[PDB]
Amino acid sequence: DKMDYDFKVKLSSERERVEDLFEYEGCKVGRGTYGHVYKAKRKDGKDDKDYALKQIEGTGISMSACREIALLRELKHPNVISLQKVFLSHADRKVWLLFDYAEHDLWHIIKFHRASQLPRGMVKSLLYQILDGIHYLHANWVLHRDLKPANILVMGEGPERGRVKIADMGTFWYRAPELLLGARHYTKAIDIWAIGCIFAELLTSEPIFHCRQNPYHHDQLDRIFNVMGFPADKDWEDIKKMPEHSTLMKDFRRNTYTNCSLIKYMEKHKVKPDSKAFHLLQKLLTMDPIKRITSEQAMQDPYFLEDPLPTSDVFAGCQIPYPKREFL
Amino acid sequence: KAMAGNFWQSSHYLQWILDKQDLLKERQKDLKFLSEEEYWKLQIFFTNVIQALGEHLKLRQQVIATATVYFKRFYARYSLKSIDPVLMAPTCVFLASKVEEFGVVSNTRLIAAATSVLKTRFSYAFPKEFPYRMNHILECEFYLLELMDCCLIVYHPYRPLLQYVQDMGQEDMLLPLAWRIVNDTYRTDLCLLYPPFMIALACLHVACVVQQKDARQWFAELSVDMEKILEIIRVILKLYEQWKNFDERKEMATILSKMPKPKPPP
Ligand SMILES: Cc1ccc(-n2nc(C(C)(C)C)cc2NC(=O)NCCCNC(=O)OC(C)(C)C)cc1
Numbered sequence: 001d002k003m004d005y006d007f008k009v010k011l012s013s014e015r016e017r018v019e020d021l022f023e024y025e026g027c028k029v030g031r032g033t034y035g036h037v038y039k040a041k042r043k044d045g046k047d048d049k050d051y052a053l054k055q056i057e058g059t060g061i062s063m064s065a066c067r068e069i070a071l072l073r074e075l076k077h078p079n080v081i082s083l084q085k086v087f088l089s090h091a092d093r094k095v096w097l098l099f100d101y102a103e104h105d106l107w108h109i110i111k112f113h114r115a116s117q118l119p120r121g122m123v124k125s126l127l128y129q130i131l132d133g134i135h136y137l138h139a140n141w142v143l144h145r146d147l148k149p150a151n152i153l154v155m156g157e158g159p160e161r162g163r164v165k166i167a168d169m170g171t172f173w174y175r176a177p178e179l180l181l182g183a184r185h186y187t188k189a190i191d192i193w194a195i196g197c198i199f200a201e202l203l204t205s206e207p208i209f210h211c212r213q214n215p216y217h218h219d220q221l222d223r224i225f226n227v228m229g230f231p232a233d234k235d236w237e238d239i240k241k242m243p244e245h246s247t248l249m250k251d252f253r254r255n256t257y258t259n260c261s262l263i264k265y266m267e268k269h270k271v272k273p274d275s276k277a278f279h280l281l282q283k284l285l286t287m288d289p290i291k292r293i294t295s296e297q298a299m300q301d302p303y304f305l306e307d308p309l310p311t312s313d314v315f316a317g318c319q320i321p322y323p324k325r326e327f328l
Numbered sequence: 329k330a331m332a333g334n335f336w337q338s339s340h341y342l343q344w345i346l347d348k349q350d351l352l353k354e355r356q357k358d359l360k361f362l363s364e365e366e367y368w369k370l371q372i373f374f375t376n377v378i379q380a381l382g383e384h385l386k387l388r389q390q391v392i393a394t395a396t397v398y399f400k401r402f403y404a405r406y407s408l409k410s411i412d413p414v415l416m417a418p419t420c421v422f423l424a425s426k427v428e429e430f431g432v433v434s435n436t437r438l439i440a441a442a443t444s445v446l447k448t449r450f451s452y453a454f455p456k457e458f459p460y461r462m463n464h465i466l467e468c469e470f471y472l473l474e475l476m477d478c479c480l481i482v483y484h485p486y487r488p489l490l491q492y493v494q495d496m497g498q499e500d501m502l503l504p505l506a507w508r509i510v511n512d513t514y515r516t517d518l519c520l521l522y523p524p525f526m527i528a529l530a531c532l533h534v535a536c537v538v539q540q541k542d543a544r545q546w547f548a549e550l551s552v553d554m555e556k557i558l559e560i561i562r563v564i565l566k567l568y569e570q571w572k573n574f575d576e577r578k579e580m581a582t583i584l585s586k587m588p589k590p591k592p593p594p
Pocket residue numbers: 029030034037052054063064065067068069071080081099101102105142143144153166167168169325
């Protein structure tokens with residue numbers, strides 16, 4: 001090798017290995033593109049805390065490995081997911097990452113309600129933390145790029161009872177129209193559009209832009225317009241600058257979505273159009289990306305001064321009716 | 329652009345701004361084989377090796393500084409015998425290029441880059457061909473990533489430098505020269521011992537003194553410990569005297585010979 005032997009045996013001896021430190025086998029909680037995730041307690045005594053233990057897909061320090069590590073190694077906010085430790089395994093060269101174990105997420109909660117409405121103090125708290133976390137990420141010029149209920153984790157019983165944790169794991173329901181009109185560049189405003197869809201989803205328990213499945217996606221657009229209405233030139237002036245604009249003009253007619261709008265949609269789902277909640281949702285679900293409010297501005301909306309105030313614990317100190325994550 | 333203002337809550341700042349006296353203590357290890365002078369000449373030599381590897385591969389100067397910081401940090405706490413610095417140099421470029429989002433440098437292209445630069449630019453130090461294959465780089469990378477405690481994002485002086493000279497309103501006169509002095513600071517321990525903006529101020533002071541431009545009032549108006557800036561000026565001014573007397577090409581084969589060698593297994 002021509003690499004010092006003492007140095008190699010010292011570091012090898014002292015190196016912590018995931019399988020010595022953590023009990024995890026049989027306790028797989030998620031598959032996916034970016035790895036397999038296991039729910040993992042510790043073998044050695046000094047912990048009651050579960051941890052999400054994630055084996056990255058593949059060998060070596062890949063571009064995806066490198067990025068995920070790079071960022072989370074720096075980020076500290078109570079509403080971003082936290083990286084407790086990295087394990088590099090020299091034998092097989094697989095990279096392991098530890099993350100504090102969030103029992104639930106918004107995909108499972110909303111679904112659970114959709115099997116039988118979603119309590120309002122909770123709804124307003126959920127959004128407020130989602131905003132506080134995303135504002136932090138945006139402040140540090142870090143865009144999420146793929147927000148949706150499956151990526152809003154919520155901590156279970158423990159010292160972080162009911163606190164939203166933003167995460168990235170690996171549909172076009174939460175995508176802003178400009179992305180669908182082939183915008184070749186992610187932005188802060190694209191995230192805020194996605195937070196808009198969630199909020200609406202929370203209030204009603206249905207996805208606002210629910211739809212069956214290049215960057216141009218026709219049927220998904222038809223749904224936005226069926227809900228939102230077709231944008232007037234005045235509403236979004238630079239729609240013409242979007243690369244798939246003339247194709248939009250080819251396949252759609254403004255008149256088709258005449259007399260249908262977000263108020264008429266939310267009215268149907270028993271959300272009152274003169275509520276602070278609606279008036280905010282509207283500012284998130286703005287079609288022209290540069291006319292959406294920022295995350296900071298939304299946090300300052302009087303909706304969060306309206307009774308009841310959002311609580312740190314999303315669950316209001318109540319019993320949690322949602323079930324624990326199944327193994328596979 | 330990511331994490332662009334997080335310095336004071338950074339892993340850089342909270343774990344990789346080292347105390348000088350701790351740094352020179354764990355250095356006494358290699359000082360039994362190399363003298364103090366020889367050791368800093370080595371540091372220049374590899375600062376220049378990483379530079380050429382950057383240049384050869386077409387890479388922005390920000391990627392080279394990151395690479396150069398990873399090389400310093402490794403040998404900042406470990407002996408020159410532990411891993412070969414000829415292996416560790418391109419490995420740092422390889423990792424930096426990933427961390428700084430320009431892409432993976434290919435197996436073939438990375439190894440040709442090493443092979444060619446030592447063959448071309450550093451023929452005097454290395455009469456045998458670059459020996460390592462890609463499996464080596466991949467192995468050393470893990471050892472490098474573990475040693476850094478996965479601290480990949482690195483702040484450099486070029487951003488604060490820029491912001492400062494734009495605030496002065498003499499960007500054209502000072503930026504070309506100040507930027508060069510900052511590159512030259514990587515020949516020293518400075519990136520391990522001072523926040524990037526300080527090194528930025530330090531360099532920017534020299535630039536103005538070399539260019540005879542008075543900026544006393546502008547400097548007076550800053551809320552920084554000017555004692556600490558004088559420390560960095562001192563070191564910049566000296567490295568240039570180090571440059572003058574150091575005859576890299578005549579000396580370095582002897583100095584690379586003195587390096588403590590790795591021990592292969594029993
Ligand atoms: C390649 C890559 C993948 C993911 C990320 N990333 N980005 C983020 C931001 C946007 C929140 C900052 C977060 C990540 N990664 C993660 O959060 N990984 C955690 C995996 C935790 N898994 C987990 O808790 O499992 C269940 C399914 C039970 C919830 C970065 C890069």
